[PDB]
Amino acid sequence: DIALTQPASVSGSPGQSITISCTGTSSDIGAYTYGSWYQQHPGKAPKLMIYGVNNRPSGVSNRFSGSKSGNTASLTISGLQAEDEADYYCASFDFSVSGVVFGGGTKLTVLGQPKAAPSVTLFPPSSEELQANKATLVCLISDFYPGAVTVAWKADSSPVKAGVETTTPSKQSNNKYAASSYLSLTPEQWKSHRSYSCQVTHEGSTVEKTVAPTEC
Amino acid sequence: QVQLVESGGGLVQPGGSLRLSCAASGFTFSSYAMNWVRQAPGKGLEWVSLISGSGSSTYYADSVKGRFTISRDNSKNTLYLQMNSLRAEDTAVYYCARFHTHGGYFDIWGQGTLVTVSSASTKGPSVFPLAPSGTAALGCLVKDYFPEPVTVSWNSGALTSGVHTFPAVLQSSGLYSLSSVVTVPSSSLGTQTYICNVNHKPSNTKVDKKVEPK
Amino acid sequence: EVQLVESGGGLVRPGRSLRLSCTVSGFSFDDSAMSWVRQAPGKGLEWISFIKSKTYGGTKEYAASVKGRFTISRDDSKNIAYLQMNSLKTEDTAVYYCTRGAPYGGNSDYYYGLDVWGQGTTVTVSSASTKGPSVFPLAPSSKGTAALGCLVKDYFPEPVTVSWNSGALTSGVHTFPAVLQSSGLYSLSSVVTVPSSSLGTQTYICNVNHKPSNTKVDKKVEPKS
Amino acid sequence: DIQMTQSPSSLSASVGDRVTITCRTSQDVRGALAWYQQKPGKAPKLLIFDASSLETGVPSRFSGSGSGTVFTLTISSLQPEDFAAYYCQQFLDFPFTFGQGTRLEIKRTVAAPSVFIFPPSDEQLKSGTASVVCLLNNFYPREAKVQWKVDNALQSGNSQESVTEQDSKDSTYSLSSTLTLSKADYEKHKVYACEVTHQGLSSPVTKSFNRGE
């Protein structure tokens, strides 16, 4: 038998080395284990970081080093950059049972980022959608960090909660977080209030984008 | 360059087959072992299958041991994984991987193909233009898409900058929603070519919508 | 436990044939791959040949330097390995090591190294017969620390034993490495450092023992008049 | 075929230094290198079996690293039992060639050599071959140039050199230069000189003997 364990999440800084430990467990482990470390950017194919204990693949930066201490293996990243935002996985290959087992993965989060206010875009119900009899009010939040921004929909200057859907923050390629909010309204409801607004709370701040039923 | 491509995927009613094929070029396909790696949406990676270079050495994982069958064709230079009795839990991205000669590590990974199982039927995207109401943002909203993914190409694919692709939205009703925004010059709004194309592979719906200033 | 002992070797003549045997104990012969490695005297390590297990095609292969003149075979049920050399060249004098190749996992065709090494056996190719060492004295004529020396010329095969004061003087005794002269024999130098006052006090006695020819040469080093 | 280059050929270190040896392969081997250790007279043993992994019979002070072309062996705290010859071997494809070989030797205070000239023996005078012996005692480092001068003219192509291993007491090396001349060649000379060039010597040390003194 063989099983792996990885830390929940590790955090460093944009100029410092950090270590992530894959801990292996087995019973009477006289078996031959080959260890590899893989990098995964959000929504992209995993890439081979380390094989063996300290072998780096060609075309991979020399900032990634590996070590084996007893059973536990370790990835050390020095010269940490914002480009190393990813998840890291450890894979153990057992030659006898000839099986490779992965771990839970670690989220390598850096702290060297600035707090940027979100950009909020509000879209009036579409003309085709308006003919469709269901109004979908679109609110897009772009370029925010750290990524936890709540959305409040206001109709007629009062809070509204029915039909509001918020997508979880997603890491944009440009080193920013973005999210979408959709408000579903009846076609008669859309021509009911004077003006509806989106109030976004990114970090303390509140950004208000207004759109009225007078789109015309 | 050495390339691994995955084909075969989409929506499968629980119990279907969905034979996946990964085609590989650039390396001698005969001498290298090939693995399949499955990633559930939002969870970690895990291993499914391994085929040796000569064949007849097939190793599956524990979760699937009488359901997935794996065949490499060196003559056609590809490798196929076949599922049977696919439970609702096995919805994931499937990655094709190569084992190096001195085995243990996945040298090259395929792009990935999406396998989703759900009793819901394929619903073609409904495309609506969110028209632009120095640079202004306008775009398209796709409602009622199931399952992912939908390609939203602005300007017939020519447009490449100023286009933000919003992440997919998991609606409560069971369908999806997606949005694509494009930042075009305020003075260029009256002359730009603003036509969007939505390709929904799961239902094979290729729609060309036109968004105009309002 | 895991033991490899090589047998054979000795002196042979150029152009003839010779056959080295390797005996193993502890690990199974059938699924363990084997290799033959050669060390020239004083030069680096050189890889000669590789035999794979019976279950991985049983192919035999060699380095390009010895291909066409070397054959490596393995015998099952005896747990031994044969290496055969035909048309030996003068250069091929060396220590031969028998090694076991380690497959990447428990089993596989691909190997990462050679784990267990036998003590190695020596193979010398030459033309000269057993010629007992000729001992010549190098007397200290300097003038402090003075050097008294014995030069052993035309010895074969190596090695010879040099003793100072019948084994008494083990301090300051330097035995130079054996040098292969172009004449085919061997040359060795023994040097001893003695005080200038001690140069004319005691008697420098050098004992040269040559086992191959059974030569016991007693050289009395004295200052040269 | 894979060509293997070993750098540097000679390593000088004391106990406690961190020593790095680099094996460079023209082809991209990618994790099929093995580092072997050989004590001067005994059989070698396998130190690093992957480009980075350790065998069981190996102390933890040996570390490996590697990427394609370049593989490195690192010793952090040099215990005295590691002074030996280190070789690399590739394993991607046959032949499994061996590297040139790197040597580790004690670093001590630079000590100049003592040069002694032993003239031809009377016994060997009638033997037929006259030997001139040049002895270099207590030298450091290893590099040393020994030149033979006959009648004030330099000679070459008739010299043999023997180098002893590192001394286990003084940490020095001794060099033996043998010049072999025929009876006619021995008679035809007037003065025989050995010229020693080394870092320790201020100037080339000339030990001369009159051929007939």
Author numbering:
A (entry chain L): 1 to 216
B (entry chain H): 1 to 133, 140 to 220
C (entry chain M): 1 to 143, 148 to 229
D (entry chain N): 1 to 213
Text of the article:
RB1, a monoclonal antibody (mAb) that binds to site IV of the RSV fusion (RSV F) protein, is a potent and broadly neutralizing against RSV A and B viruses. One potential approach involves using anti-idiotypic antibodies (anti-IDs) to mimic specific antigenic sites and enhance preexisting immunity in an epitope-specific manner. Methods: In this study, we isolated two anti-IDs, 1A6 and 1D4, targeting RB1 CDR regions, demonstrating that 1A6 competes fully with RSV F in binding to RB1. We determined high-resolution cryo-electron microscopy (cryo-EM) structures of RB1 Fab binding to 1A6 and 1D4 Fabs, elucidating the differences in the binding mode of these antibodies to RB1.
